Protein backbone atom coordinates (compact mmCIF):
# COMPACT_ATOMS: atom_id res chain seq x y z
CA UNK A 1 0.00 0.00 0.00
CA UNK A 2 2.69 2.69 1.21
CA UNK A 3 5.16 4.21 -0.30
CA UNK A 4 7.89 2.89 1.95
CA UNK A 5 6.48 -0.60 0.32
CA UNK A 6 6.46 0.04 -3.21
CA UNK A 7 9.61 1.51 -3.25
CA UNK A 8 11.44 -1.01 -1.08
CA UNK A 9 12.19 1.06 2.19
CA UNK A 10 13.65 3.91 3.66
CA UNK A 11 16.97 4.41 1.82
CA UNK A 12 15.11 3.96 -1.61
CA UNK A 13 12.42 6.74 -0.26
CA UNK A 14 14.80 8.86 0.81
CA UNK A 15 16.85 8.70 -2.53
CA UNK A 16 13.96 9.36 -4.41
CA UNK A 17 12.53 12.31 -2.47
CA UNK A 18 16.35 13.79 -2.13
CA UNK A 19 17.02 13.53 -6.17
CA UNK A 20 13.21 14.89 -6.98
CA UNK A 21 13.67 18.05 -4.73
CA UNK A 22 16.98 18.41 -6.27
CA UNK A 23 15.62 18.40 -9.84
CA UNK A 24 12.67 20.84 -8.72
CA UNK A 25 14.96 23.42 -6.98
CA UNK A 26 17.05 23.68 -10.30
CA UNK A 27 14.08 23.80 -12.42
CA UNK A 28 13.41 27.61 -13.50
CA UNK A 29 10.03 26.64 -14.75
CA UNK A 30 8.78 26.56 -11.06
CA UNK A 31 11.59 26.97 -8.36
CA UNK A 32 9.48 30.91 -7.59
CA UNK A 33 6.51 28.75 -6.47
CA UNK A 34 8.78 28.22 -3.57
CA UNK A 35 10.08 31.32 -3.28
CA UNK A 36 8.22 32.19 0.48
CA UNK A 37 8.26 28.31 1.57
CA UNK A 38 11.37 27.22 3.38
CA UNK A 39 13.35 24.10 2.87
CA UNK A 40 11.36 22.02 5.17
CA UNK A 41 8.24 22.45 3.75
CA UNK A 42 9.62 22.59 -0.04
CA UNK A 43 11.11 19.08 0.56
CA UNK A 44 8.23 17.91 2.34
CA UNK A 45 5.88 18.76 -1.08
CA UNK A 46 8.38 16.93 -2.95
CA UNK A 47 7.86 13.61 -0.86
CA UNK A 48 4.00 14.44 -1.02
CA UNK A 49 3.41 14.59 -4.56
CA UNK A 50 5.88 11.59 -4.45
CA UNK A 51 3.30 9.98 -2.41
CA UNK A 52 0.38 10.71 -4.46
CA UNK A 53 1.74 9.88 -7.61
CA UNK A 54 2.66 6.51 -6.37
CA UNK A 55 -1.01 6.07 -5.71
CA UNK A 56 -1.32 7.52 -1.88
CA UNK A 57 -3.94 10.04 -2.53
CA UNK A 58 -5.99 9.16 -0.21
CA UNK A 59 -4.42 12.41 1.73
CA UNK A 60 -4.85 14.64 -0.83
CA UNK A 61 -8.54 15.72 -0.86
CA UNK A 62 -9.65 17.87 -3.75
CA UNK A 63 -11.06 20.22 -1.70
CA UNK A 64 -7.76 20.57 -0.02
CA UNK A 65 -5.51 20.61 -3.23
CA UNK A 66 -8.00 23.66 -4.13
CA UNK A 67 -7.66 25.49 -1.38
CA UNK A 68 -3.56 24.73 -0.98
CA UNK A 69 -2.50 26.05 -4.18
CA UNK A 70 -5.13 28.94 -4.40
CA UNK A 71 -2.78 32.06 -3.66
CA UNK A 72 -0.49 30.18 -6.75
CA UNK A 73 -3.17 30.17 -9.04
CA UNK A 74 -4.04 33.41 -7.81
CA UNK A 75 -0.79 35.50 -7.48
CA UNK A 76 2.06 33.02 -8.88
CA UNK A 77 0.43 32.16 -12.12
CA UNK A 78 0.18 28.30 -11.44
CA UNK A 79 -0.90 26.50 -14.32
CA UNK A 80 -1.03 23.43 -16.77
CA UNK A 81 2.58 23.71 -18.26
CA UNK A 82 3.72 24.24 -14.08
CA UNK A 83 2.07 21.08 -13.27
CA UNK A 84 3.26 19.12 -15.80
CA UNK A 85 6.37 20.30 -14.76
CA UNK A 86 6.20 18.72 -11.72
CA UNK A 87 5.34 15.22 -12.96
CA UNK A 88 8.09 15.14 -15.49
CA UNK A 89 10.71 16.27 -12.57
CA UNK A 90 9.32 13.23 -10.68
CA UNK A 91 9.73 10.96 -13.96
CA UNK A 92 12.83 12.26 -14.52
CA UNK A 93 14.05 11.07 -10.97
CA UNK A 94 12.61 7.66 -11.22
CA UNK A 95 14.34 7.04 -14.62
CA UNK A 96 17.50 7.88 -13.18
CA UNK A 97 17.15 5.74 -10.16
CA UNK A 98 16.65 3.11 -12.46
CA UNK A 99 12.70 2.35 -11.89
CA UNK A 100 11.53 0.35 -14.19
CA UNK A 101 9.91 1.88 -17.55
CA UNK A 102 6.31 0.25 -16.69
CA UNK A 103 6.31 0.97 -12.98
CA UNK A 104 7.38 4.86 -14.01
CA UNK A 105 4.16 4.61 -16.62
CA UNK A 106 2.13 4.02 -13.62
CA UNK A 107 3.61 6.74 -12.04
CA UNK A 108 2.85 9.01 -14.86
CA UNK A 109 -0.72 8.12 -15.05
CA UNK A 110 -1.57 8.93 -11.57
CA UNK A 111 0.88 12.17 -11.13
CA UNK A 112 -1.14 13.26 -14.37
CA UNK A 113 -4.80 12.38 -13.30
CA UNK A 114 -7.18 15.10 -14.51
CA UNK A 115 -9.07 15.47 -11.64
CA UNK A 116 -6.45 16.34 -8.96
CA UNK A 117 -4.63 18.74 -11.82
CA UNK A 118 -8.24 20.59 -11.85
CA UNK A 119 -8.18 20.81 -8.27
CA UNK A 120 -4.51 21.90 -7.61
CA UNK A 121 -5.09 24.55 -10.90
CA UNK A 122 -8.74 26.13 -9.14
CA UNK A 123 -10.19 24.97 -12.47
C1 LIG B 1 -1.37 16.60 -7.42
C2 LIG B 1 -0.26 17.51 -7.34
C3 LIG B 1 0.14 18.06 -6.11
C4 LIG B 1 -0.09 17.63 -4.85
C5 LIG B 1 -0.66 16.26 -4.43
C6 LIG B 1 0.31 18.68 -4.01
C7 LIG B 1 0.18 18.64 -2.63
C8 LIG B 1 0.51 19.68 -1.81
C9 LIG B 1 0.19 19.68 -0.41
C10 LIG B 1 -0.24 18.53 0.54
C11 LIG B 1 0.38 20.92 0.03
C12 LIG B 1 -0.04 21.47 1.38
C13 LIG B 1 0.98 21.57 2.44
C14 LIG B 1 0.40 22.29 3.68
O1 LIG B 1 -0.85 22.31 3.96
O2 LIG B 1 1.25 22.87 4.38
C15 LIG B 1 0.92 21.67 -1.06
C16 LIG B 1 1.37 22.95 -0.94
C17 LIG B 1 2.03 23.59 -1.99
N1 LIG B 1 2.25 23.04 -3.27
FE1 LIG B 1 1.48 21.45 -4.00
N2 LIG B 1 0.80 19.78 -4.70
C18 LIG B 1 0.62 19.44 -6.01
C19 LIG B 1 0.99 20.19 -7.11
C20 LIG B 1 1.74 21.35 -7.03
C21 LIG B 1 2.32 22.06 -8.16
C22 LIG B 1 2.07 21.70 -9.62
C23 LIG B 1 3.09 23.07 -7.58
C24 LIG B 1 3.99 24.03 -8.08
C25 LIG B 1 4.47 24.10 -9.41
C26 LIG B 1 2.89 22.98 -6.15
C27 LIG B 1 3.39 23.89 -5.25
C28 LIG B 1 3.02 23.94 -3.93
C29 LIG B 1 3.23 25.09 -3.07
C30 LIG B 1 4.15 26.28 -3.36
C31 LIG B 1 2.64 24.86 -1.88
C32 LIG B 1 2.73 25.74 -0.65
C33 LIG B 1 4.07 25.58 -0.03
C34 LIG B 1 4.29 24.23 0.52
O3 LIG B 1 3.53 23.88 1.46
O4 LIG B 1 5.25 23.54 0.03
N3 LIG B 1 2.08 21.94 -5.82
N4 LIG B 1 0.99 20.90 -2.18
Same mark, same amino acid.
Given at each position: STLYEKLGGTTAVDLAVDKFYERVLQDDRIKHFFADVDMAKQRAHQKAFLTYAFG???????????????? @???????? =???? &??? +? $?? @???????? =???? &??? +? $??????????????????
Amino acid at each position: STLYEKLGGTTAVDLAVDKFYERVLQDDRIKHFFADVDMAKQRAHQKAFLTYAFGGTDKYDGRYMREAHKE @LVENHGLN =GEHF &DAV +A $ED @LLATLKEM =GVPE &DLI +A $EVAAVAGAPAAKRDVLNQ
